[PDB]
Design a protein around this ligand. Structure first.
Ligand code: CHL
Ligand code: CLA
Ligand code: CLA
Ligand code: CLA
Ligand code: CLA
Ligand code: CLA
Ligand code: CLA
Ligand SMILES: CCCCCCCCCCCCCCCCCC(=O)OC[C@H](CO[C@@H]1O[C@H](CO)[C@H](O)[C@H](O)[C@H]1O)OC(=O)CCCCCCCCCCCCCCCCC
Ligand SMILES: CCCCCCCCCCCCCCCC(=O)OC[C@H](COP(=O)(O)OC[C@@H](O)CO)OC(=O)CCCCCCCCCCCCCCC
Ligand SMILES: CC1=C(/C=C/C(C)=C/C=C/C(C)=C/C=C/C=C(C)/C=C/C=C(C)/C=C/C2=C(C)CCCC2(C)C)C(C)(C)CCC1
Ligand SMILES: CC1=C(\C=C/C(C)=C/C=C/C(C)=C/C=C/C=C(C)/C=C/C=C(C)/C=C/C2=C(C)CCCC2(C)C)C(C)(C)CCC1
Lengths: 35, 24, 348, 76, 36, 68, 35, 183, 59, 490, 31
């Protein structure tokens, strides 16, 4: 089955996407409308 | 007389028997 | 662009904003440097200020405990965590931040973000040198601080029994790691540290000589006694007499540089060759492949009770470091030494 | 524009940074003096190092069960 | 720009930086980490 | 000046033929980045099993795997 | 008739660095090699 | 729906989720200079845009499916007549050579030499042709009943009959591949 | 090795590592090795193209 | 002309001399492999595989032949401890000869490609200059790589056609070369499962074939042609040096930590097995399995294999060595002859005592004798002027069980101190310092020497990745910078 | 003003004054 160690790990790759995406989302937001 | 746990505690104490389940 | 004129995608709109000549250069590497290097510095300044080491080490290491700048540190995890990465979502910490700090996981926060910070800073100076169209020698020199950092903070504890024997991030905490390597590894005797000293302490010589040889062979290009005013960085001529500098050292020291380009590369070469050799010695100490003993002088000093060298004095001093710190340096061993079994000279 | 010496000599800089800067110093003063720094980071107070169970240094000694063990070492 | 003199800023800010540092040496002899 | 023609050289000749020829634009770069990040995710699987940082109930993760 | 023909050069200052380097390494390491 | 297909072809449908047979443009980059005797070596430049294999891809489905139709029709009846699984052939033929219960005299070492001469040389002769419609659809002895007099370039589909049966035979042998080791 | 004995005994009797003037001396030789590599590489990375790739740039 | 450190860059422009110069390196590597295997066979002592195995004798490449099935020799002997009735052609000496015969064949091929460098294959059509199609060249070699990977995994390892790999028990006692079955669940990523090795090379071999078919057909992007500098033979060098230090950290990492691809009967135990009490716990697990069923002490300690007690010894720990303590592990403490028993310590109050073992850090370590509950009761003190834990006053006797000193007791306070200082080193063994004239201080195993080379190589190849990645991105400014380059400031 | 130069200094300066308020209150924690 799925262990809690795998639950927190797959939750980290979701959280690692919301961090790495949001850093990428912030540099494609300032690139377009210049704030 | 001696468990295998408290024979590897006074001899090595880094033992994988002595380190796991050591919340007791 | 590209001398075939395609239409710009969102990459080109992102590449020119990152590679912008603003006040602080971000670049593509700054998506790796500035989040990681701010959290290594932010993790170190938080851990030295607030985070305890009472559970991982049994000793206080923060300003809130009573430590000052010299004795506060971000200390390594316990030897019971082995090489665990101690993610805050890890199996040890499990989401709780206030126990992740108590478990020494904030050490590996600083060590990993510092390691990817050094990758971000070394890629920064490939990226700037390609913008400025220079040669990439500033990055190649920074391979040697990355050779030192990876071999000591990462490669060394991976060969030992855990992240415990890593250096903690502090002043007095580095100092015991230094005294750990004398007592246990005899690391002064290791010939890779000897090439590391001769590189580090020989680059300090080259820094002081080249600075003083330039500053004392300057051309009189001004009238006043401030010689720093008589320079414009858009001048085409040398600001100091290389020919006078050569004749000076060829008569003082007998051997001088005659090539200005070889000089500045030799200033590049000595600290980098010195640190890469010393990094190999710490790789050797990760496996405890020490240069501890000269066996031909241990066989002689055990078969001759009057043969004393400064070497055998050093071996006795390391026995003193090993037995007197390891009841407190390695608390995971839980070794108690009765005071009559520790080595001891006369009347001390 | 604004090269680091028309900012520090401007009075509008100091009508901001004589209000936000002391209120941030006091915010750091009150983060520790209200004892909240001992709670967020789990550093023990000077009356919290030694419970009645142990009178020695703690030792974590267990990898995967360290989370509830450090709760027992701290005395919670 | 030039509403306050830069040398009077650098004197005053430098003074309570030396003044804050003297608190760090005062607190090194009393309270936590005073060895008493 | 022509090179040296060999029987194996002409059997292998169309393999060293289209040197310098590329797709315009980005091509399969976005396809590559999906495969890099899956392999980055795959290398985080095997790094943490061998570190005992992601725990699977099926593995033993010890020398006791050699028993069963 | 290879067009890729180059020559190696080694001036005397590089001779003196090279001979020094392999004697200083022999001064250093042979104490460990003879053990 | 794709546009680079659907004409003079049996499977006139745009199934492609990704366009593997898409004729793509190409641009030729120049060769970078690597001469040391020059002071500066440049990274090359864009030289030649080139306007631009559906014929190659048609041949390669036809070969795979026809080997699959020899495989699917050959594994069901050797399981029926002999009474051995299709995966088990080779384990039981190394011990005793047979065909439909009839013992064969060949050592297993000879089968490597027989197959790489016979099947190998026939594979060396198939690619000895330089006409892609003749490569897909040859004439001669392989058409003894004269399909080639019958046309299919119009709505007649006298060629579009092996191609559907080649497709699911690859799939049913792919279904044999997901059944052999696992189940 | 006699130097090494002199250092080890010095740190036991005088605690040289915790002395600020030794801390400044380490900052002088770590800074002096940083600045030797820093000034040494910026000059090397700014050399005017005078030679080819078949001969050293020191020519 | 060129400097001394730049001489090999005459090969960067012509691909025919690049074949010839990699062929000469390949002739030297396999020429080393056969020559080192001939040297190791000529000095290997196959007499005692139980108590003088290959990792004890300094054999470095002989555990790599034995890892992939080669267990027999042309001298009759095997590794498992029996006579080879048919050694075959793939002996140790057959493989040591097969690398030397290959070394001369690769030598002659390099002489051919050096003279016949100007092949028409290396000149691309319609420009006529020497060029290499590095995206397709990679697609060829990745296709061959996954074809060998799948071939090694489905046939050699799985035992379908090849022999198999080495598989042992958890405790290094019963180990052979036998075929493995691939394991496709989550269990295949446990690196102590040998089934995950076969399941790797099938799955990575199939994907490497499918990836190879991609890079044969699909040309790269133009934006990714310039950004990775694909038209240079050095941007493949930088990325390959990046590939081989990554691999050398993984390879030296699994050698040091232990894996199913690094058995302990071939490479010796790991340092984490001494530290974590791996064999000590099992030795106690088997004594308590016999004292619970009803048996004596000396009849239970005799049932432990002499090979299992040899793993429980600090001299076979790979981290008890030295950088210039050169040679075999037998050159340090001697060739092990026989297990000398199990030292059990009792004092005058009839209480058992347990020697605190030497941790792996300690060159020297004080001997301490702790009770059941972990409290020090006896030691060999440094100051003997007013002692309170001396062996003489506490009355420590030592009895052995099993081994060469079975049922024998020592009460002499000089004798007890000798065996107390041997019991902190592990199980008690009898050596001979006369057969090889042993020094007296331990060495490291080949598990430690392999790890030392392959992290020092993986770290020096990080710098070579840094150098050769910099020479591709900064290829245009290698000989210096332009004269008008002052536009980069404000 | 939220620019890159503003986020560079106030990434450093804002926690620096927060910790300097914290460290100053630690000098007067007696026990
Ligand atoms: C080209 C298509 C082709 C495919 C997909 C297969 C695949 C197979 N062959 Mg086969 N073969 C094929 C052509 C050939 N084989 C062989 C000679 C053999 C032999 C001797 C054996 C196989 C076996 C097998 C089966 C099990 C694989 C295994 O590892 O058994 C090992 C796993 C368990 C025994 C499997 C169905 C094996 C088998 O039948 O075992 C059941 C077997 O022993 N093949 C020859 C030479 C005559 C071929 C000619 O091209
Ligand atoms: C390319 C496809 C292909 C392949 C590789 C094989 C291969 C094989 N078949 Mg199959 N077979 C095929 C097509 C194929 N056949 C077709 C199209 C039919 C229908 C007519 C059959 C009907 C068939 C039967 C009825 C039997 C085999 C048997 C065999 C096996 C040994 C006999 C042999 O090859 O001698 C060929 C010799 C002369 C032509 C061998 C594994 C025999 C066996 O013992 O299998 C284990 C067996 O009994 N096959
Ligand atoms: C086909 C011919 C052949 C064969 C059968 C062998 C067989 C053997 N060799 Mg020899 N050898 C050969 C050619 C051959 N060799 C040549 C040409 C050379 C010169 C390069 C050598 C040099 C050599 C040395 C130096 C040594 C051997 C050794 C050995 C033995 C163990 C091999 C081993 O463990 O390697 C392990 C092999 C690997 C771990 C492979 C590493 C490849 C990495 C993992 C792949 C990474 C790149 C890949 C492309 C990534 C993409 C994968 C996928 C996506 C496609 C074995 C008897 C060893 C021995 O005991 O000999 C005395 C030994 O030390 N060989
Ligand atoms: C279901 C199929 C299957 C199965 C069962 C396996 C099974 C396995 N694979 Mg394979 N694999 C497969 C499919 C499969 N693979 C496929 C399809 C691919 C794509 C081609 C791969 C690609 C692949 C790679 C590339 C690797 C494996 C590895 C492994 C092993 C993982 C356990 C291990 O040894 O960890 C040990 C390995 C790790 C923990 C890897 C972590 C990598 C670290 C971070 C590298 C550190 C170096 C780096 C520069 C850090 C700096 C230095 C540091 C000191 C600071 C195991 C044998 C690994 C292996 O062979 O190990 C021996 C490995 O490296 N696999
Ligand atoms: C990665 C490569 C590698 C590895 C791990 C090993 C590992 C091993 N070898 Mg093998 N060997 C190798 C490559 C390798 N070998 C090669 C390339 C050769 C051909 C020369 C040999 C030839 C060889 C022989 C002939 C013997 C071994 C032996 C050994 C064992 C003892 C190790 C030892 O004494 O180290 C010694 C390590 C050092 C001295 C530290 C080296 C540190 C650097 C390199 C020193 C250089 C500094 C300086 C510039 C040198 C100048 C000093 C001058 C006075 C010489 C060990 C199992 C011995 C053995 O046990 O066989 C049974 C043995 O007799 N090896
Ligand atoms: C796959 C590995 C590989 C390959 C093919 C190359 C290839 C090249 N390198 Mg690179 N390099 C590498 C790894 C590699 N290097 C590594 C790991 C480092 C870090 C140390 C470097 C650092 C480096 C620098 C700093 C320079 C090169 C240069 C060169 C070029 C000329 C080399 C030459 O003339 O040497 C000539 C060497 C000699 C005449 C004698 C060298 C003797 C030393 C002491 C080694 C002793 C040999 C030993 C027996 C072999 C053991 C090696 C070990 C790995 C097994 C050539 C393109 C040069 C270049 O780019 O020119 C423009 C250059 O300046 N390389
Ligand atoms: C200090 C480290 C360092 C530096 C400065 C460089 C520098 C360079 N590399 Mg190298 N490289 C490195 C490490 C480094 N590399 C490592 C460790 C690997 C893996 C073996 C590679 C593999 C590699 C390849 C295969 C290639 C390069 C290339 C390049 C060049 C282009 C820039 C680039 O793409 O960077 C590479 C980018 C990075 C290093 C940044 C990635 C960092 C990510 C974001 C971190 C992800 C880790 C994850 C979040 C942490 C979880 C794991 C944790 C638990 C440990 C440049 C010369 C290319 C080249 O030479 O082109 C000409 C090329 O083809 N590099
Ligand atoms: C051309 C040929 C000449 C070239 C120059 C020759 C000298 C080159 C420098 C040699 C350095 C090593 C000399 C060892 C001397 C010695 O005492 O060996 C002596 C040993 C033999 O040692 C003997 O072994 C015997 C058993 O056979 C017995 O045990 C003996 O007691 C023991 O003395 O020879 C070696 O071990 C050579 C091993 C070489 C590889 C070791 C591992 C290397 C891994 C690290 C690689 C990277 C290192 C960092 C690089 C940066
Ligand atoms: C009155 C006092 C007497 C003089 C003091 C003692 C003099 C010692 C001089 C040693 C010179 C060695 C130069 C070798 C190599 C050599 O000939 O260098 C020559 C070199 C000349 O460089 P150029 O720039 O002229 O080279 C041009 C070429 O690179 C091509 O452009 O001079 C230097 O590099 C200066 C650095 C000297 C660094 C001195 C090294 C330190 C001492 C060496 C270790 C000694 C160990 C002793 C152990 C017992
Ligand atoms: C002709 C011929 C032949 C022969 C062949 C031969 C005889 C070969 C040999 C070969 C060989 C015999 C080879 C060898 C090699 C070796 C090597 C190659 C080595 C190297 C070394 C090294 C590399 C080292 C390194 C190092 C050092 C320096 C020190 C330590 C560390 C290290 C390791 C790093 C015959 C008759 C068969 C027939 C065919 C042809
Ligand atoms: C950690 C962490 C975190 C958080 C937070 C952070 C990151 C923070 C940062 C913070 C910071 C970043 C801080 C800083 C600080 C600073 C300081 C604390 C400083 C101090 C200084 C001083 C004390 C000085 C003094 C002096 C001198 C010596 C010189 C000048 C003058 C004077 C006297 C003033 C996160 C979430 C990410 C995650 C988890 C972990």
């Amino acid at each position: 089955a799925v262990t809690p160690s795998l639950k927190n790990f797959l939750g980290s790759l979701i959280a690692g996407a919301t961090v790495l995406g949001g850093i990428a989302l912030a540099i494609t937001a300032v690139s377009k409308f210049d704030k | 007389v001696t468990l295998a746990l408290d024979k590897d505690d006074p001899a090595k104490e880094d033992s994988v028997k002595g380190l796991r389940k050591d919340i007791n | 662009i590209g001398t075939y004129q395609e239409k710009r995608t969102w990459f080109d709109d992102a590449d020119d904003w990152l590679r912008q000549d603003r006040f602080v250069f971000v670049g593509w590497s700054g998506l790796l440097l500035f989040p990681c290097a701010y959290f290594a510095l932010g993790g170190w300044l938080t851990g030295t200020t607030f985070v305890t080491s009472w559970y991982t080490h049994g000793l206080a290491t923060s300003y809130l405990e009573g430590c000052n700048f010299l004795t506060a540190a971000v200390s390594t995890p316990a030897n019971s965590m082995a090489h665990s990465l101690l993610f805050v979502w890890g199996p040890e910490a499990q989401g709780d931040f206030t126990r992740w700090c108590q478990l020494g996981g904030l050490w590996a926060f600083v060590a990993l973000h510092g390691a990817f910070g050094l990758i971000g800073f070394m890629l920064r100076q490939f990226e700037i040198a390609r913008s400025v169209n220079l040669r990439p020698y500033n990055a190649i020199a920074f391979s040697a601080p990355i050779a030192v950092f990876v071999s000591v903070f990462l490669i060394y504890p991976l060969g030992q029994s855990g992240w415990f024997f890593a250096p903690s991030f502090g002043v007095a905490a580095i100092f015991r790691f230094i005294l750990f390597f004398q007592g246990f590894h005899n690391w002064t005797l290791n010939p890779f540290h000897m090439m590391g000293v001769a590189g580090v302490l020989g680059a300090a010589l080259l820094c002081a000589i080249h600075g003083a040889t330039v500053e004392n062979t300057l051309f009189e290009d001004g009238d006043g006694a401030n010689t720093f005013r008589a320079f414009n960085p858009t001048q085409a001529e040398e600001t100091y007499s290389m020919v006078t500098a050569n004749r000076f050292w060829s008569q003082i020291f007998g051997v001088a540089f005659s090539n200005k380009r070889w000089l500045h590369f030799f200033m590049l070469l000595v600290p980098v060759t010195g640190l890469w050799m010393s990094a190999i010695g710490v790789v050797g100490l990760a496996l405890n492949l020490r240069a501890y003993d000269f066996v031909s002088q241990e066989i002689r000093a055990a078969e001759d009770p009057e043969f004393e060298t400064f070497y055998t004095k050093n071996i006795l001093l390391n026995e003193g470091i090993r037995a007197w710190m390891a009841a407190q340096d390695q608390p995971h061993e839980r070794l108690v030494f009765p005071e009559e079994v520790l080595p001891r000279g006369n009347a001390l | 524009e604004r090269p680091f010496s028309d900012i520090l000599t401007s009075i509008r800089y100091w009508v901001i940074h004589s209000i936000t800067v002391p209120a941030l110093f006091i915010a750091g003063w009150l983060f520790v003096s209200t004892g909240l720094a001992y709670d967020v980071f789990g550093t023990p107070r000077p009356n919290e190092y030694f419970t009645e169970d142990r009178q020695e240094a703690p030792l974590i000694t267990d990898r995967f069960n360290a989370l509830e063990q450090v709760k027992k070492l701290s005395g919670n | 720009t030039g509403r306050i003199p830069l040398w009077l800023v650098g004197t005053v800010v430098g003074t309570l930086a030396i003044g804050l540092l003297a608190v760090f040496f005062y607190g090194s002899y009393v309270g936590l980490g005073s060895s008493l | 000046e022509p090179g040296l023609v060999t029987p194996l050289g002409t059997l292998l000749r169309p393999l060293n033929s289209e040197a310098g020829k590329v797709l315009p634009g980005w091509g399969t770069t976005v396809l590559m980045a999906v495969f890099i990040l899956l392999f980055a995710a795959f290398l985080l699987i095997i790094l943490e099993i061998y570190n005992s940082s992601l725990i699977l109930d099926d593995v033993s993760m010890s020398w006791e795997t050699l028993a069963k | 008739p290879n067009p890729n023909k180059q020559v190696v050069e080694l001036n005397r200052t590089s001779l003196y660095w090279g001979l020094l380097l392999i004697f200083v390494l022999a001064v250093l390491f042979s104490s460990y090699i003879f053990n | 729906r794709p546009e680079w297909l659907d004409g003079s072809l049996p499977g006139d449908r745009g199934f492609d989720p990704l366009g593997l047979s898409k004729p793509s443009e190409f641009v030729v980059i120049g060769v970078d200079e690597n001469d040391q005797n020059a002071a500066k070596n440049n990274k090359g430049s864009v030289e030649a845009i080139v306007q631009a294999g559906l014929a190659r891809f048609r041949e390669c489905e036809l070969i795979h499916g026809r080997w699959a139709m020899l495989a699917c029709l050959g594994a069901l009846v050797a399981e029926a007549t002999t009474g051995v699984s299709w995966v088990e052939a080779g384990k039981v033929e190394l011990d005793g050579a047979s065909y439909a219960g009839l013992s064969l005299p060949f050592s297993i070492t000879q089968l490597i030499w027989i197959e790489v001469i016979l099947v190998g040389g026939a594979e060396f002769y198939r690619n000895s042709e330089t006409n892609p419609e003749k490569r897909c659809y040859p004439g001669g002895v392989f058409d003894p009943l004269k399909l080639a007099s019958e046309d299919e370039e119009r709505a007649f589909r006298l060629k579009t009959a092996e191609i559907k049966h080649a497709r699911l035979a690859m799939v049913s042998f792919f279904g044999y591949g997901v059944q052999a080791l696992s189940t | 090795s006699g130097t090494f004995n002199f250092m080890i005994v010095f740190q036991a009797e005088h605690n040289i590592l915790m002395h600020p003037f030794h801390m400044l001396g380490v900052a002088g030789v770590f800074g002096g090795s940083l600045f030797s590599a820093m000034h040494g590489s910026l000059v090397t990375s700014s050399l005017i193209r005078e030679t080819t790739e078949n001969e050293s740039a020191n020519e | 002309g060129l400097p001394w450190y730049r001489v090999h860059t005459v090969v960067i422009n012509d691909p025919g001399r690049l074949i010839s110069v990699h062929l000469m390196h390949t002739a030297l590597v396999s020429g080393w492999a056969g020559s080192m295997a001939l040297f190791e066979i000529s000095v290997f002592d196959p007499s005692d595989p139980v108590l003088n195995p290959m990792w004890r004798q300094g054999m470095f490449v002989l555990p790599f032949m034995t890892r992939l099935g080669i267990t027999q020799s042309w001298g009759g002997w095997t590794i498992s401890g029996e006579t080879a009735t048919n050694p075959g052609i793939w002996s140790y000496e057959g493989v040591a000869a097969a690398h030397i015969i290959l070394s001369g064949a690769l030598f002659l091929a390099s002489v051919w490609h050096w003279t016949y460098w100007d092949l028409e294959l290396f000149r691309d059509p319609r420009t006529g200059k020497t060029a290499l199609d590095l995206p397709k060249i990679f697609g060829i070699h990745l296709f061959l790589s996954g074809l060998l990977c799948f071939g090694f995994g489905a046939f050699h390892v799985t035992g379908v056609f090849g022999p198999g790999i080495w598989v042992s028990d958890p405790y290094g006692l019963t180990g052979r070369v036998q075929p493995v079955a691939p394991s496709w669940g989550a269990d295949g990523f446990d690196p102590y499962n040998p089934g995950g090795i076969a399941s790797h090379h099938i799955a990575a071999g199939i994907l490497g074939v499918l990836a190879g078919l991609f890079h044969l057909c699909v040309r790269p992007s133009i934006r990714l042609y310039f950004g990775l500098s694909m038209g240079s033979i050095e941007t493949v060098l930088s990325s390959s040096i990046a590939a081989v230090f990554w691999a050398a950290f993984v390879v030296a990492g699994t050698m040091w930590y232990g894996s199913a691809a690094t058995p302990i009967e071939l490479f010796g135990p790991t340092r984490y097995q001494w530290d974590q009490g791996f064999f000590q716990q099992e030795i106690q697990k088997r004594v308590q399995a016999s004292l619970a069923e009803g048996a004596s002490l000396s009849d239970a300690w005799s049932r432990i294999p002499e090979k299992l007690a040899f793993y429980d010894y600090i001299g076979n720990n790979p981290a008890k060595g030295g950088l210039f303590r050169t040679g075999a592990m037998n050159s340090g403490d001697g060739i092990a002859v026989g297990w000398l028993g199990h030292a059990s310590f009792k004092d005058q109050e009839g209480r058992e005592l347990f020697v605190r073992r030497m941790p792996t850090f300690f060159e020297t370590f004080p001997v301490l004798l702790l009770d059941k509950d972990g409290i020090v009761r006896a030691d060999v003190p440094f100051r003997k002027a007013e002692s309170k834990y001396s062996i003489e006053q506490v009355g420590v006797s030592v009895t052995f069980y099993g081994g060469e000193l079975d049922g024998l007791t020592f009460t002499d306070p000089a004798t007890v101190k000798k065996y107390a200082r041997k019991a902190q080193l592990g199980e008690i063994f009898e050596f001979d310092r006369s057969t090889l004239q042993s020094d007296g201080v331990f060495r490291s195993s080949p598990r430690g020497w392999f790890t030392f080379g392959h992290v020092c190589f993986a770290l020096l190849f990080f710098f070579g990745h840094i150098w050769h990645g910099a020479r591709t991105i900064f290829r245009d400014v290698f000989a210096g910078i332009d004269d008008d380059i002052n536009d980069q400031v404000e | 003003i939220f620019t890159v130069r503003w986020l560079a200094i106030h990434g450093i300066a804002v926690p620096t004054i927060f910790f300097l308020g914290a460290i100053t209150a630690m000098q007067f924690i007696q026990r």
